[PDB]
């Protein structure tokens, strides 16, 4: 599920098309997971161990990031493709 099916669910999603005109495209390309981490109230990441998750009533979860290419066309016959890495 993690290695293949998630990436396929992302890849087969239709890209998002928006209008007012200014056309906007969104496409999701690549998928990333880190090891299960935890941010305290300071927002500081640290590796979370499963015993900590059992003890502190947390969820042994890993954050998920995606690379997103937004391609905006302002009906001037030009396409600006801006990429957000690891969203």
């Amino acid at each position: 599920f993690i290695q293949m099916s998630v990436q396929r669910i992302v890849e087969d999603a239709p890209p998002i098309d928006l209008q007012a005109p200014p056309r906007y495209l969104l496409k999701f390309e690549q998928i990333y997971l880190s090891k299960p981490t935890h941010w305290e109230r300071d927002g500081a990441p640290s590796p979370m161990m499963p015993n900590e998750a059992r003890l502190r009533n947390l969820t042994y979860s890993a954050p998920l990031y995606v690379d997103i290419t937004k391609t905006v066309i302002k009906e001037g016959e030009e396409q600006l493709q801006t990429q957000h890495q690891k969203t």
Partner: peptide, 16 residues
């Protein structure tokens, strides 16, 4: 396939 990120590549954007 899904890439792995190390904990050092996690920017501190979750705090901001």
């Amino acid at each position: 396939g899904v890439k792995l990120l190390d904990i050092s590549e996690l920017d501190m954007v979750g705090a901001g």
